[PDB]
């Protein structure tokens, strides 16, 4: 049961995000870990089979019911 977002750039990362563990702690964190910022990343979930572009994200959404996809972000 963990969610698959991958870091900007090009990177698959997947950690356990059970209880309710909004994008916001999940990217906070690993954007931290970093040294980025949520001003410049933005969220972007994986193409439900659509044209050829990331869809968008909400910067609230539940991780821990998006689990067996995987989530992305990049510099907005």
């Given at each position: 049961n963990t969610i698959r977002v991958f870091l900007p750039n090009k990177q698959r990362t997947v950690v356990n995000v059970r209880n309710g563990m909004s994008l916001h702690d999940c990217l906070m964190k690993a954007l931290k870990v970093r040294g980025l910022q949520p001003e410049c990343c933005a969220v972007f979930r994986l193409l439900?089979?659509?044209?050829?572009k990331k869809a968008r994200l909400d910067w609230n959404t539940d991780a821990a019911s998006l689990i067996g996809e995987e989530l992305q972000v990049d510099f907005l």
């Open positions: 439900q089979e659509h044209k050829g």
